[PDB]
Design a protein around this ligand. Structure first.
Ligand SMILES: CC(=O)N[C@H]1[C@@H](OP(=O)(O)OP(=O)(O)OC[C@H]2O[C@@H](n3ccc(=O)[nH]c3=O)[C@H](O)[C@@H]2O)O[C@H](CO)[C@@H](O)[C@@H]1O
Ligand SMILES: CC(=O)N[C@H]1[C@@H](OP(=O)(O)OP(=O)(O)OC[C@H]2O[C@@H](n3ccc(=O)[nH]c3=O)[C@H](O)[C@@H]2O)O[C@H](CO)[C@@H](O)[C@@H]1O
Lengths: 350, 350
């Protein structure tokens, strides 16, 4: 049994993919990757012991479907190239995780009669996934609403976060300033870098903060905190030991990218989500479940202010937090990785 | 508003299409037809006062499923024209009846985001419809079992048959010899042309027969009736007024072609179905619904014998016959043309 994972461009699509792959390789599967050379998967996949065939999707990047409907020809090359790869690798099934490289590969798998399985990581169906679903054999999504009748299996979660102790054990008799973790996605978010320091001035000693500013802002965010009179807080450009940071925290203030959301849930951590501002409210839809489950609270730009932030924090006792942490863990889907690996296997057995 | 109807070259595909097209044109809709120039529709549709655009689908007819998986480019030009024409006409929705053309035009309408509506005439789907049914917005079938669970709508039935009185009105009160109508599709069936004469020799004066022999076999069958010593029976090559014959019959012995079945059901007639012997067993499936309701009885060629027919006929009393007629009608879908037309309209509005 052979499999070809189709994902690239961002870690949002690549990491959940590598996770499902390694999982099936341990089951004896032969996995091969379909990506693009000028992008992230080019260097990452190899370091995972998975071969990767490349194709070029030049004038295919940033296409709004009306551009594809308007001009099909553009996808014809990649389609051709993909059919070639699968002509040679004879995959039993293909797994699309989203991203531009997923369009050609999906169409190709489908034209050859090879079953195509799809995983959507966000609350709002992305680029190719929206139109690629049409020719899919099975669709799965992380949270509800991306697609009408699609199974909710959640996002595969990084191992180090899955090994975190449950809330109870973690918050067992904790005392002192609420440990506040601030995270702005892998890049960092200006909004948090400029808001949290002022929130520190208002809460003062009621909290101890660990602030992740993103590359090139550590010095900036640090100085802001000092000028607010709270020099003791810790600022980091990028936290490598994300899991330990999660385990240390009482609560988290952060953007709501899909994986971060899933991780917080699996980690059982109270959250105050500050969704990225966009007409699609993707980030907003990624956090809804944890909120609707009563484990967090969302604040879009409309209601985002220094006070609303400090206000929301001052009201969560360690009692509430402990309650929110369990609601988060209960609302999580830790075994997402196998849930997808199994559906793929399931379709494999025609 | 504007609709593109796609029907191959064959009565089963065009007549149902024509019916629906006429129904919509009477409701304002503008209709365009897509077919071939070397097939039946390249003469009939124009006569029904409808515009028809042709497309070369030569290197497409004959080749099967795996034949297309191997040579995807074969349907390229067809798609070229199919799509091209739909840009110059701009359909709001397309209806595929089943013919070859059905494919190219469907792929085109699909690649243009134009909704696709499909209708299957037989209990078992043809080539094009089988696959074309994956990129369809709505799927309909005359009989159950041609597709997973498409909405059963039946087949459009010729007006002159619909205009018939109900079974009760014309069957109760009849006395004397049972009227047997022997029909063998629009071409006549050799097997019935040989069996019936013997059946008559065995049934004698208990029945009066009207036998439709198909073109070029009138004298042959007549002579055969002469042998049995039953010269009185009527033998016709092709009954022009099928309605009068149906209304006359007390029972029918015939083939199970899709349209003929819908006619028998709407007319409310008891039947002895002798499916066209074939590997796909298409005609067998077309007849099953009537048997399941006990409105008819089936006998495939393999089990077909002079005596099975005679005994079967001998066992049907004048009273039970009127019950079968009642359930035949009760199991018919008189308003197919309207259901399909409505679905087409329903979809179009979006
Ligand atoms: C452009 C934008 O608005 N953001 C998008 C971006 O989020 P973004 O990529 O910025 O955040 P994601 O959820 O994607 O990824 C975060 C990942 O980085 C890790 N991490 C983060 C910070 C840190 O200091 N250390 C660390 O290890 C987290 O554990 C997690 O694994 O991609 C997501 C899809 O995946 C989308 O849902 C977001 O909408
Ligand atoms: C050419 C050929 O070999 N088969 C054709 C034949 O199959 P076939 O004969 O099997 O078609 P069907 O049984 O589905 O339809 C029969 C139709 O012919 C009418 N009828 C039949 C006998 C008669 O004497 N008078 C009469 O008017 C019936 O009322 C009915 O409307 O018709 C189909 C529908 O047109 C075509 O798709 C097929 O290509």
């Amino acid at each position: 049994k052979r499999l070809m994972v189709m994902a690239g461009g961002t870690g949002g699509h690549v990491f959940p993919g590598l996770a499902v792959a390694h999982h099936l390789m341990a089951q004896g599967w032969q996995v091969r990757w379909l990506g693009t050379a000028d992008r992230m998967e080019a260097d990452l996949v190899p370091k995972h012991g998975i071969e990767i065939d490349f194709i070029r999707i030049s004038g295919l990047r940033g296409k709004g479907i009306k551009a594809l409907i308007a001009a099909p020809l553009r996808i014809f090359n990649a389609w051709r190239q993909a059919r070639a790869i699968m002509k040679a690798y004879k995959p039993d099934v293909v797994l699309g995780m989203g991203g531009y490289v997923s369009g050609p590969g999906g169409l190709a798998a489908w034209s050859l009669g090879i079953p195509v399985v799809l995983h959507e990581q966000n609350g709002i169906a992305g680029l190719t996934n929206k139109w690629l679903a049409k020719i899919a054999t099975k669709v799965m999504q992380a949270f509800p609403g991306a697609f009408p009748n699609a199974e909710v299996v959640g996002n595969p979660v990084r191992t180090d976060v899955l090994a975190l102790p449950l809330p109870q054990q973690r918050l067992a008799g904790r005392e002192g300033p609420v440990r506040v973790l601030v995270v702005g996605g892998s890049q960092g978010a200006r909004i948090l870098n400029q808001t949290m320091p002022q929130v520190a001035a208002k809460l003062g000693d009621s909290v101890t903060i660990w602030h992740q500013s993103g590359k090139g802002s550590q010095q900036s965010v640090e100085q802001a905190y000092a000028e607010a009179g709270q020099p003791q807080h810790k600022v980091t450009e990028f936290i490598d030991d994300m899991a330990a940071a999660y385990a240390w925290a009482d609560v988290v203030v952060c953007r709501s990218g899909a994986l971060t959301v899933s991780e917080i849930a699996a980690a059982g951590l109270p959250a105050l989500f500050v969704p990225f501002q966009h007409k699609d409210r993707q980030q907003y839809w990624n956090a809804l479940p944890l909120e609707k489950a009563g484990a967090a609270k969302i604040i879009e730009q409309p209601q985002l202010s220094v006070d609303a932030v400090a206000n929301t924090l001052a009201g969560w006792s360690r009692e509430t937090l402990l309650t929110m942490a369990e609601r988060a863990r209960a609302a999580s889907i830790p075994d997402a990785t196998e849930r997808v690996a199994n559906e793929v296997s399931r379709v494999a057995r025609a």
